[PDB]
Amino acid sequence: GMDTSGKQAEAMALLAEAERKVKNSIEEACEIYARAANMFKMAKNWSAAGNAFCQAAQLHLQLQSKHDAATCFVDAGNAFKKADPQEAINCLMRAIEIYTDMGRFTIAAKHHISIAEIYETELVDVEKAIAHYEQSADYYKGEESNSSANKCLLKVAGYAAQLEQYQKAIDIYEQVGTSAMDSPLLKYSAKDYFFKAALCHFCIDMLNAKLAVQKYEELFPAFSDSRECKLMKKLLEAHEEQNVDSYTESVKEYDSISRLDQWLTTMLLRIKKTIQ
Amino acid sequence: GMDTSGKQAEAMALLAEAERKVKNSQSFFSGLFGGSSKIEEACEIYARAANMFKMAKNWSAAGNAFCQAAQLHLQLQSKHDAATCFVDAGNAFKKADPQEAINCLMRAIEIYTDMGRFTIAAKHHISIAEIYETELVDVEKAIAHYEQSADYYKGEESNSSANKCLLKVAGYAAQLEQYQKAIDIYEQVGTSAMDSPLLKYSAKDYFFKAALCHFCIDMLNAKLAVQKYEELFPAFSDSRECKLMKKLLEAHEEQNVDSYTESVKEYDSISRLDQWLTTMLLRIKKT
Amino acid sequence: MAGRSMQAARCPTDELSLSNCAVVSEKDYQSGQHVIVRTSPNHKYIFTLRTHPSVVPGSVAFSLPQRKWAGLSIGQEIEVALYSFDKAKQCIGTMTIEIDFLQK
């Protein structure tokens, strides 16, 4: 349709006009660049719109402007998000650096979360996602935003248990559960976290899991009443006899009563495989 | 990692440069009368030093820089930025040194209330009460701060926020074995909350607590108070609370400790009990 | 002698598990050496050492019966100090032992 060709031609004309204006040597050039990038965005030419945005941001930063420069850098980053993830990462890193320089820690943490998200979803990398999530959690905890920090720590612990050693998962789950028990609204969920921790201990050895569950049961009396406690006690007893059939029966019955996360399935499969 | 050493070294260098700048500022003013450009620039360096120190996880240095900047900008007659930096100290020294954060927040509160900005003063008072409560068991100061914040909020006509402060004050006072204040606050809030559409569902709970807080005084007045509450809020009868109180009263009327304990255990089994309720029930059972 | 801290390990071999001797690294102790293991102020358990090459220095391997009797868990930290008997008074003359089939 007319949109593609017309907007592309107008964008090229505006880019040439801004280039000529700077060739005379200034805010007018930045305005022309911003308008041309906007029309590029309308034209669906996702690529090369971030290029114009970056050029405008650099030109504006040339005259000591930092706020609008950071906003346009973030704009170019999100524009490149779909067209080119790597340059989106770079633009977001620049914006994070500047925002941290002015000390707007919430914006930096949000951008770190976005960076971790793009890294984990499109590209394949867990360590970078873990580091970015940890940085965002540290920023938020410094800003005492407890819920976001808890979410980030839970995600990091989940990934660490998924691939990394279980000590990080043990620590994070224990800390989060301990913080959660006292909370009036959140107390009900606390059990969950504790349960997860216990399972990770089982991956190391049965005796470590036994001592950990004993300590948790002592610490949290309600945990004794949890169906989870009964399930782990039964599973540990079955494992202690090298009897796989009881293991399978208990797992199947528990799944029948309630569906599985597919994380518990993975951990239980790992534990069963090592029963020998 | 590199962060600690690098940030520390750069922050020390920048802070020393700022100290030299402020040292030379007096000579510049005496010889040329440059104005406040040097002082403003020094304050900028100091604020940057504080923020970098915060990034470097060195909270004490950041708090010291914030306090210095507060003092310097207050010396420039800018009480608003001085109060902002006083609150910066209050929130930076909060973890490094709670005591310093206390006086910083008092200074900020005084500055703010000087202009009549009561909401910010009440928020700071609430923060200070939280600081007192979380670390120290000096309940009395927490009660005083909460009462002051509640009075400020009531003076601002912002209801539903002074209410929570009054509930906290009453709950803490009930722990000190002074029941009249707790009874009065609980009954007042309950009677206020009956009529609210959204809060109505919760109102019943308050009455329960009051009656329990009225239980330690003596059995007979608790019975009559139960009658008074029930006639005013007939729906209260439906709640399990009335049944539990009636059963406990019947058990205690004949010194039947076993029945009282069994009923308490059953109710806890159905729904886990709170530490406050557990303590109150244990105190009542002593009789 | 004064006692050192380390991490409990798993018994390396079935024979050593049957020996009922705490398996140690040659670099840490010697075969026949005798120790007292502290897990807490009120928990002291008495063991005899036997060296095995596979033991990592700074760790001692214990069998499942030893772990259960002493309540020792793999990866837990424990202190251990060389203990010497008073053979003039602690040498054993008679042992009444309760025996049962290990596996039903």
Short mmCIF file of N, CA and C in Angstrom, two decimals, chain A residues 30 32 37 62 68 188 205 225-226 245:
data_model
loop_
_atom_site.label_atom_id
_atom_site.label_comp_id
_atom_site.label_asym_id
_atom_site.label_seq_id
_atom_site.Cartn_x
_atom_site.Cartn_y
_atom_site.Cartn_z
N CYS A 30 17.62 16.96 15.80
CA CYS A 30 17.14 15.91 16.69
C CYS A 30 15.64 15.69 16.53
N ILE A 32 13.85 16.28 13.83
CA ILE A 32 13.65 15.62 12.54
C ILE A 32 13.99 14.13 12.65
N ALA A 37 12.21 8.55 12.80
CA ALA A 37 12.17 7.26 13.46
C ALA A 37 10.74 6.85 13.78
N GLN A 62 25.07 15.06 23.26
CA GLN A 62 26.17 15.97 22.96
C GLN A 62 26.01 17.30 23.68
N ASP A 68 16.16 12.89 28.54
CA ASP A 68 15.59 12.53 27.25
C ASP A 68 16.52 11.60 26.48
N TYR A 188 0.11 -18.99 54.92
CA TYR A 188 -0.45 -20.24 54.42
C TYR A 188 0.46 -20.90 53.39
N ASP A 205 21.58 -36.63 49.68
CA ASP A 205 21.53 -37.91 50.38
C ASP A 205 20.23 -37.98 51.17
N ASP A 225 1.48 -31.29 60.16
CA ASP A 225 0.16 -31.65 59.67
C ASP A 225 0.08 -31.67 58.15
N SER A 226 1.05 -31.07 57.46
CA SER A 226 0.99 -30.99 56.01
C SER A 226 0.99 -32.38 55.39
N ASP A 245 8.74 -50.06 44.17
CA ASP A 245 7.30 -50.14 43.96
C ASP A 245 6.55 -49.22 44.91
#
